Design a protein around this ligand. Structure first.
Ligand SMILES: Cc1nn(C)cc1-c1cc2c(N[C@H](c3ccc4c(c3)S(=O)(=O)CCC4)C(C)C)ncnc2[nH]1
Length: 168
């Protein structure tokens, strides 16, 4: 259960590893994997496309049924759906996409959703092509998340700049 291996503990509740979140999910099968989702839950590329493809589109079919019945999420919001073969549950969380003009204050609201789950495997919200400064996203995670979060960052160069900023 939640057999995370090779993480570096940054704070009492935040751990980090240079790894592909999809490979971590297949190995660990955590209770909750966080998806870096968008408001209409269309998993077209990046982390979301990679998680969806590893479920062989089961994630997208289920997401389409959620949107039909409930409408889109809001920026900073989330929903819990099945984790399929990757986890017991997937927490779809919408961080702001600053590359498309969304506000950075909503990154705190996005991280707040992690607090409803005791243990989560997660990506660095709003990083990559969402355009937020990745070190700033780590600082928001550290100040906001109180439950136990295992961050998988699939880039050694970025992993080392995060750990360097955090420890020195
Ligand atoms: C793509 C891909 N293809 N396959 C097969 C695996 C992956 C893969 C990518 C990836 C990952 N990337 C990081 C990241 C973090 C957050 C966001 C993005 C990207 S984004 O998709 O550009 C926009 C949404 C927010 C980078 C900063 C290194 N972090 C962990 N696991 C990952 N797995």
């Amino acid at each position: 259960v939640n057999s995370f291996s090779g993480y570096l503990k940054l704070t009492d509740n935040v751990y980090i590893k240079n790894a592909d979140i999809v490979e971590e999910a297949k190995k660990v099968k955590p209770t909750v994997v966080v998806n870096a989702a968008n408001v209409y839950l269309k998993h077209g590329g990046g982390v979301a496309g990679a998680l969806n493809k590893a479920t062989n589109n089961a994630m997208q079919v289920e997401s389409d049924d959620y949107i039909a019945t409930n409408g889109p999420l809001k920026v900073g919001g989330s929903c819990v759906l099945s984790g399929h073969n990757l986890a017991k549950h997937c927490l779809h969380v919408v961080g702001p996409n600053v590359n498309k003009g969304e506000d950075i204050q909503l990154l705190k609201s996005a991280y707040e959703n992690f607090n409803q789950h005791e243990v989560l495997l997660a990506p660095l919200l709003s990083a990559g092509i969402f355009g937020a400064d990745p070190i700033h996203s780590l600082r928001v995670c550290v100040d906001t998340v109180r439950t136990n979060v295992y961050l998988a960052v699939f880039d050694k160069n970025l992993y080392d700049k995060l750990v360097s900023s955090f420890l020195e």
